[PDB]
């Protein structure tokens, strides 16, 4: 509870990158849900297609997947690792995706308390 | 100097391009506002690509991409 929800994606996408559990993309990210093993999805409200959100909110809800609301979709390309770093630590090449799906969690508890208390409050 | 440009390069042996429509999952999915998942194409019954990986629906057959299974 010491960390905010809008920054709660950061450390969990870092600790799950070491196990290759981040579905960059949209089609293969949605097909990970049809493997019935993914655990969370993030929708960026800065969107481009009205057809795009109404399918993914229909897929994640009926198969019991919650949601993390972050605004911008070029912003989500950083923590998935889809952006190339510069020499001193800046994303010199910005490539941002609008759908991020995790499959397996990292081995920690600094995010595994805050994502759980964000989960249980909307039940 | 000491060469000629010769203009004799003929690479005109055209390859393909991957024509993808914008988010082909909309070609794959169709959902009404009540929440129905209407998979418009067949699902392959193979062990490797079962229940998540969708087939093709051609003019006369079904067709896979992983194991290239075919029907009529
Ligand atoms: Zn397959």
Automatic annotation (TrEMBL), chain B:
Positions annotated to bind Zn(2+) 2: 49, 67
Annotated residues for binding of Zn(2+) 1: 44, 49, 64, 67
Cellular localization per UniProt: Cytoplasm
Job of this protein: Component of the 40S subunit of the ribosome. Part of the small subunit (SSU) processome, first precursor of the small eukaryotic ribosomal subunit. During the assembly of the SSU processome in the nucleolus, many ribosome biogenesis factors, an RNA chaperone and ribosomal proteins associate with the nascent pre-rRNA and work in concert to generate RNA folding, modifications, rearrangements and cleavage as well as targeted degradation of pre-ribosomal RNA by the RNA exosome.
Family: In the N-terminal section; belongs to the ubiquitin family. In the C-terminal section; belongs to the eukaryotic ribosomal protein eS31 family.
Subunit structure: Part of the 40S ribosomal subunit. Part of the small subunit (SSU) processome, composed of more than 70 proteins and the RNA chaperone small nucleolar RNA (snoRNA) U3.
The protein, known as: Ubiquitin-ribosomal protein eS31 fusion protein
Source organism per UniProt: Homo sapiens (Human)
Gene expressing this chain: RPS27A
Part of the full-length chain shown: 78 to 149 of 156
């Amino acid at each position: 509870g010491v960390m905010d929800v809008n920054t709660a994606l950061q450390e969990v996408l870092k600790t799950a990158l070491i196990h290759d559990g981040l579905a960059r993309g949209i089609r293969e990210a949605a097909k990970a849900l049809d493997k019935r093993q993914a655990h969370l999805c993030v929708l960026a409200s800065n969107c481009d297609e009205p057809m795009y959100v109404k399918l993914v909110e229909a897929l994640c809800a009926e198969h019991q997947i919650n949601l993390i609301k972050v605004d911008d979709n070029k912003k989500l390309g950083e923590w998935v690792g889809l952006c190339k770093i510069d020499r001193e630590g800046k994303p010199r090449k910005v490539v941002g995706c609008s759908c991020v799906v995790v499959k397996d969690y990292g081995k920690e508890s600094q995010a595994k308390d805050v994502i759980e208390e964000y989960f249980k409050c909307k039940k | 100097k000491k060469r000629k440009k010769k203009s004799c390069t003929t690479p005109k042996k055209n390859k393909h391009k991957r024509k993808k429509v914008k988010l082909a999952v909309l070609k794959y999915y169709k959902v009404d506002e009540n929440g129905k998942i209407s998979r418009l194409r067949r699902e392959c019954p193979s062990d490797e690509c079962g229940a998540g990986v969708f087939m093709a629906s051609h003019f006369d057959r079904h067709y896979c991409g992983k194991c290239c299974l075919t029907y009529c």
